[PDB]
Amino acid sequence: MITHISPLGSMDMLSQLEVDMLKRTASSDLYQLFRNCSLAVLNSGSLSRFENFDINVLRRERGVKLELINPPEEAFVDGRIIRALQANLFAVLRDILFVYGQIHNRFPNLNLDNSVHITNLVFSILRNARALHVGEAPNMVVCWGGHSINENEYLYARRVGNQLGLRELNICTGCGPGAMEAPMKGAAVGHAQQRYKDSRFIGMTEPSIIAAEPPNPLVNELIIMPDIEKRLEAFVRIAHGIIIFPGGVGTAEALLYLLGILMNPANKDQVLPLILTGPKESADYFRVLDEFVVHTLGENARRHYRIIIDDAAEVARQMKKSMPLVKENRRDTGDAYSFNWSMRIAPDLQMPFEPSHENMANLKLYPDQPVEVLAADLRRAFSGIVAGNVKEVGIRAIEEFGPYKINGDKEIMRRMDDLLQGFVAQHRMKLPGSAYIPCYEIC
Amino acid sequence: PALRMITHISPLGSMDMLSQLEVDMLKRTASSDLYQLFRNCSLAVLNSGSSKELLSRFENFDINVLRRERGVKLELINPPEEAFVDGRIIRALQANLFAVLRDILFVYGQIHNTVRFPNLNLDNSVHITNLVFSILRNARALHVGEAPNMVVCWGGHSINENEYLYARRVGNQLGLRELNICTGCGPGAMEAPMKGAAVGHAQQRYKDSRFIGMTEPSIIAAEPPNPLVNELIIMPDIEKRLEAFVRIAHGIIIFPGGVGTAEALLYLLGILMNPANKDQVLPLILTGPKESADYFRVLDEFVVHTLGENARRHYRIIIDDAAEVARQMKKSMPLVKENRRDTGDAYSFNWSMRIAPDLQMPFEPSHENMANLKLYPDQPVEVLAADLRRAFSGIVAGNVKEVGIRAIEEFGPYKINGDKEIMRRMDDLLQGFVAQHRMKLGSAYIPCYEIC
Amino acid sequence: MITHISPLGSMDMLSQLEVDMLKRTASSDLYQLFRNCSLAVLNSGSLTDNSKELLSRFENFDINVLRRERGVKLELINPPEEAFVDGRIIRALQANLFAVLRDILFVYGQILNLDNSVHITNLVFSILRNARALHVGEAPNMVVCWGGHSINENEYLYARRVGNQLGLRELNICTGCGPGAMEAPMKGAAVGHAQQRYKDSRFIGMTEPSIIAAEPPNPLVNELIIMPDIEKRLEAFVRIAHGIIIFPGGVGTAEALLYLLGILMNPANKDQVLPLILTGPKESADYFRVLDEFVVHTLGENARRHYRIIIDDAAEVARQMKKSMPLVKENRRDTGDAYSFNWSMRIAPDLQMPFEPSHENMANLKLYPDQPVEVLAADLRRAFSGIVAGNVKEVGIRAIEEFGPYKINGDKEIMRRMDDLLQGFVAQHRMKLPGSAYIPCYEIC
Amino acid sequence: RMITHISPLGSMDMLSQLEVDMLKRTASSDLYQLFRNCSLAVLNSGSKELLSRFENFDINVLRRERGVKLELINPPEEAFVDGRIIRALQANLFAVLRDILFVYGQIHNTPNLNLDNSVHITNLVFSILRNARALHVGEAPNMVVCWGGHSINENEYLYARRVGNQLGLRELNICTGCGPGAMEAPMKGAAVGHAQQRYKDSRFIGMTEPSIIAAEPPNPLVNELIIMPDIEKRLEAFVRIAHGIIIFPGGVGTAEALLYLLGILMNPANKDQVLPLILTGPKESADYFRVLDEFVVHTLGENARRHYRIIIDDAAEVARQMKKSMPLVKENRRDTGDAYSFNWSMRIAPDLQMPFEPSHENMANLKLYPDQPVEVLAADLRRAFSGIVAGNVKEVGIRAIEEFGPYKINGDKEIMRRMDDLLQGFVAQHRMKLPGSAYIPCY
Ligand SMILES: Nc1nc2c(ncn2[C@@H]2O[C@H](COP(=O)(O)OP(=O)(O)OP(=O)(O)O)[C@@H](OP(=O)(O)OP(=O)(O)O)[C@H]2O)c(=O)[nH]1
Ligand SMILES: Nc1nc2c(ncn2[C@@H]2O[C@H](COP(=O)(O)OP(=O)(O)OP(=O)(O)O)[C@@H](OP(=O)(O)OP(=O)(O)O)[C@H]2O)c(=O)[nH]1
Ligand SMILES: Nc1nc2c(ncn2[C@@H]2O[C@H](COP(=O)(O)OP(=O)(O)OP(=O)(O)O)[C@@H](OP(=O)(O)OP(=O)(O)O)[C@H]2O)c(=O)[nH]1
Ligand SMILES: Nc1nc2c(ncn2[C@@H]2O[C@H](COP(=O)(O)OP(=O)(O)OP(=O)(O)O)[C@@H](OP(=O)(O)OP(=O)(O)O)[C@H]2O)c(=O)[nH]1
Ligand SMILES: O=P(O)(O)OC[C@H]1O[C@H](O)[C@H](O)[C@@H]1O
Ligand SMILES: O=P(O)(O)OC[C@H]1O[C@H](O)[C@H](O)[C@@H]1O
Ligand SMILES: O=P(O)(O)OC[C@H]1O[C@H](O)[C@H](O)[C@@H]1O
Ligand SMILES: O=P(O)(O)OC[C@H]1O[C@H](O)[C@H](O)[C@@H]1O
Predict the structure, then answer these.
(1) How many CB atoms within 10 Å of residue C429?
(2) Domain range B6-115, CATH class
(3) Whether C222 and D170 lie within 8 Å, measured CB to CB
């Protein structure tokens, strides 16, 4: 049961030599990753049911075509593939076969350890994805949120979305469900009411995530950054403003990434508004969160972030006001509106981190350390926990090597565990499906 | 002199180019008795997205027309604040406001200000049909050469969530096939198809969704527009608003509705049975979720009784398969194109559709008029449904429209008479409509109608 | 040999009754005008300028209006073969063709009291709005240009360069839809639009049914408007223009320059902002000297406040206009006026009232210096239209056949100074395109 | 103002910082003289005498965080309107930046680019064309490449304006060598045509090369300037982008192109290709074409009159033909799975892709003999015309033919004899040099 999809959105003008490299990489051991990311995309609107599915790349003189063998029928309306899903499909080929292949094959001097190279790559990737619009006045609000979230948390984030869209702002989330879908959903409705024509709804994700988490159907720009170290850096550089909702260990982990970069002294003059918000009930959640930050980083971290409870209008209003300040801030520095080139991200924050049980129990989670190293290695630990929850390698590794164990001191490790268990009690650790098994053991 | 909230809105969408003498027309008509109407229509528009209860909270509101040499501007005094963002009027409400200005003070204003010699009135079905065209062209709803995608959806204002989601789902399939929606500019079944169609449009990167809302002054004064509408049109008569529905449409889908939705159907079915329209293609398809099976079965029995079992060659009833409902309309789009190509008719306005003058003639819901409705099978099915349409439109007057909402206790509640089995098959439907809350949204409902 | 033209640009959406109306209007005696205006449109340039002579070759032509349910179409019977590319009517001509259906059969046919100066003006707005010429929310860029239907190649070159400069400053041009001066600026402005990547060129040709039937549209025009009177065509020219560049011309260009100056010198329009520049190519020195020498003491001495003369600086001329734009935009905000239409300009009913030459009417011309500056220019405009009527306008040509040259009355050295102007027009070969000699329909003194 | 800072327009709009760096290194390298001279030329669209009239001119690359700007020291006063660079000049300027410093720099200093493989040289030409956003995707064929002399009389210049008009009347675009005479009048005529048919979005490409551009500024009609590295690859891009060629009356070069074409057309694997070649002239041209036809038939084969067609003084027919052929290409493309914008399928033989160093030793080893296969013939026939063209404008070749000896070539005498009659006629046609100063042969 075979369908020949032509390119939409991406990979339209391919050279004949590139077409050959795409076909090679698609026969390589990368196949399954390119398969699954491609089956996920075809299944936005929620893997093991579609074991018949297989996607073959097809060489034509002009460019490439994708062949869909036993694809999921709901991605087709009267025969034709839904345009959005078709384009996400080709975005996966772009950022899986094209991107992730090319960075290993070859490229003369791609250090991949020079934090310069690393940032220029994240620029390149966004550029190839046609996501850095030239002469674009700043409108993008990177939203961060938890994937399992309450109907009230959802209804609240939809309202924040709607107010953002009523102020002609665009959204960039994790390409996923719950809080990454609901701001897009709400913004769309505002855009409409204000006759906004061209909505951008970027979804920023990574290969391991997108294999088990389809995009939400709202995304119209799908970027698969290779590692969360890049995905996170990409979040920061493209955004002109961040709103961190109630999330789990992922959303938590992103916060430390921000705060690691924002506290740096080099970025004392950079302009990137951070606003943690939530509904009236989230107030307790933020309490703990905030105290946890104060204690790990200082009262000096509260200067970079602001908490608004149960005022979505103001939350949007604040960002719509900030946008003229992100514009001027980039104008003075001679920076790009698209890409926050000037922001100083620390090699300790860009360096890929492999979440091995060893690495997690040698984390420098001690107060005798600079705040940078603390939040950096904090984040490192928050990524392993995201590992044992969703990423395939982690969910298996915890059930075969045993939970992650963590070092540190108490009050530090003490308070965090109060976060972690608190997260579970809110069920933001795992989808409502079944229950949750801690992949972590904190003293 | 007291504390007031002032804003000035510049024309968006309509009334952008205005000669100076026209500007004088509008200002005069806005001092005319038409003010109160104009005011409450513009109030209803502002209150899109939030029943007279809302309108008795904005009694401080007043809308004043401003002259400038170039054209016009609209002054909002104590406007509802929920219609502004950071002090700026939401663009959509801004255009709908200037739609109201067009269709109430320009359109309906020039009409209200014409002679009505009842000795020699222009009952000409050509006027009513060229007029209906002229109204749509002024509201820029008639796009040259745009191929047929408009699907006119009908349904009750008060419907149950199961219906609402179904109309929503039907909407989704409709838009997933790059099809536009036209409705009654209202809540319930009149917004839920747009809501779902919207999502389909997105998934397919369908730019320029047209969600036209055909209403009428009475309805819109009391019922603000539903938020999904982008082209708002305020046709003067339910008689002309109906006819507009029919001509612009390239497909019709009737959901489960109360009196209004019923009355439109008879109006439609009447134009479909007319012989000159045996070669005209316009797909009519009633749909609803599973629970509406019964409703429609009754519905059918009423129609076949009033029209014959030959009615059923003009519609098709689909239950719980919104995908197919859209699939079919989508399939029928090419037919309507060629049907218009052959005859040389226009995509936008069905000029060849013969609509009968007794279907185009307005029916004042006088209680005397109402019982004089010849509801007898000896008459052509044409005249049977014409009067049957007219009866169904009276009940809606008693329920929503001002004249007859209160004109009913004064001059008395409505009473219809004719063939008894006809009146009987009506009561099951009407009294069924009461049990489905398709008459009124409910907390309270008065019959406003009486049959032996 | 028949071909079927569907509507392009205008008369796209039409109600069945309207189509019905156009059908009858086409069967009326207007047919000749409607077919005559249609024939010029279909000839435009095509490397032939013969006034009426070229058109005599197409005596078999005929255009019938067709009625379809959707709208209207146009039937071309024996149409000039040069208006077709491999069978397809060239789109510009097709649009200009359909503009004649709009403005001859729809507009002109249907002609509200037309002596009320208010109704007149709002009629002129309604004609322009119909041709979608008053665009909404457009910063001012329109420089109306006036000139001569006949001009040596010297002036043509200059006005291309003026037009090139003008275009190079993202300025659109508007003329009288004719040749020579009414084409050159567009020809260059277009070039200039290219270099500065200005995509939406707007080259408006505004004309009357009297002129279009004998002077076809130059092919540069992409917005054609056929206003009914020269009186209404002029009124339009003024309202839509945000600047005006007068080149050298004959008696027609002359007719405008008094029209305009009359309106500007009126007191109510002292605060209005409309930059008037006269430019010529160096050799125009004397022509502009004798023109200025004429105006100074025929009309007011103070009238040199309302025009600036520039010779052989095409750059500066366009620069000045490109600076004037923001002032005109400010002048409209302050008045709360529109950019597209200058409503506030007080145009006198004496400048709105059509003029029929005859001969008594030329005798009853109050050309006296005692007369107000205004009254003087109103009838001074009229005098020139006489010479423009019997020059080319068929009604006037026949009228100078029977009763001969118009007897221009007036008085004062005013008459002698008209004569040495008029003598120059003919002596400079700006009164008739080269082909025969010229027969003065004017008898001064 | 004597200094002005021009922003990127049309190219080089989105640049990564590592890129912005490499550009300045290349501006600091000896390439500057080329980049200066091409940028002077671009700015003088409105003869190498004007090069010595602007000696103080100098153009510098400004680095910014966002991207690059261009610093213009003492530019020709004619390029600015009220101080603002003419939008079109500005974009030509940045195409010089794109194609001299980015393209020309990067390929010479690399090496995984073999540049000796005909698969490489071909995909490079695709690449540069894509990079200059000139290969439009999903564009129905309309691109009519027009070849012809730079020194052509007023009858030919006017005729090509007519064949240009007629092409525009029929909504066809034009591509030439960014030059005067025949390379301008078509575009001049074509654009009137596009006006008359309300054709918006005209395309007027100009393929040229660094040695050419620096002494011959682009004509003012060109809106896409493309500067391919050499004449060998310039021609390849000519061919491959074009859906139809018209060869006007030209000299050497217009000579050199035709043998290039014919070499590729007569080659067997290209007998199924669809690319009309109409050689047209204005009636007095009959004699020049006569001599031309007699020449090829002998020098190649009477089997060559299959690939070209001669029309004289029928501009409307020349256009009429090409418009009919525009659909025929589409099928020829759609069948093979080829791209409408690039003619991937055509087999250009490597002998025609390999740059020919116009040296005297090399000019001797030109197999100019009728025993060789018509393919081999052509290739070396072309190489010979690259030699003479060098003698005329190319710096390398004007220097080599100065005191170091005019270019000398021989072979079969009938062949040689045909040549001297042609070349002699070119001199007599003043197609070899523009001005009336008598021309001195390099042959
Ligand atoms: N600074 C900045 N400019 C950008 C960016 N993306 C596009 N641009 C535009 O590039 C233009 C460059 O103008 P400048 O800021 O004065 O130049 P700079 O780069 O800062 O250094 P320079 O002084 O030349 O040496 C701006 O036009 P204007 O500001 O003059 O007018 P407007 O925004 O209204 O359109 C911007 O609109 C960006 O990320 N940062
Ligand atoms: N008659 C009519 N035509 C419409 C309508 N909407 C779009 N069109 C188009 O306008 C074009 C005019 O077609 P005609 O040549 O005039 O049809 P004819 O029957 O031959 O003569 P007639 O209309 O009676 O005067 C149509 O065909 P095309 O040129 O596009 O090609 P195509 O027709 O192949 O689809 C349609 O595409 C409409 O409501 N009515
Ligand atoms: N004068 C004029 N204005 C128009 C026209 N069409 C829209 N407008 C808008 O009207 C604005 C005038 O400014 P306002 O202070 O708000 O006055 P208005 O309410 O519009 O009328 P009012 O003058 O008070 O009677 C301009 O915005 P700006 O703030 O940018 O002012 P600008 O472009 O002039 O620099 C225009 O954008 C028009 O045809 N003429
Ligand atoms: N060959 C070609 N196709 C292009 C190009 N750009 C887009 N396309 C489109 O890609 C479609 C390919 O359809 P396919 O089913 O795959 O059939 P083929 O063309 O034979 O290629 P295939 O062998 O399957 O790989 C074409 O549809 P149609 O063939 O029906 O043509 P159109 O719609 O434009 O009128 C084109 O519309 C291009 O540069 N070249
Ligand atoms: O917070 P979780 O939902 O538990 O983990 C994934 C998140 O990590 C990132 O910040 C994205 O916003 C994701 O939403
Ligand atoms: O309650 P109902 O009157 O039945 O619902 C309102 C509908 O009746 C009218 O015809 C309009 O089409 C509306 O869609
Ligand atoms: O009659 P001419 O003076 O020779 O030229 C025609 C002029 O008369 C009209 O007003 C046009 O705008 C032209 O300026
Ligand atoms: O001026 P000529 O030297 O005679 O001709 C040179 C041609 O060869 C090149 O392809 C260019 O496009 C030119 O058209």
Answers:
(1) 15
(2) alpha beta
(3) no
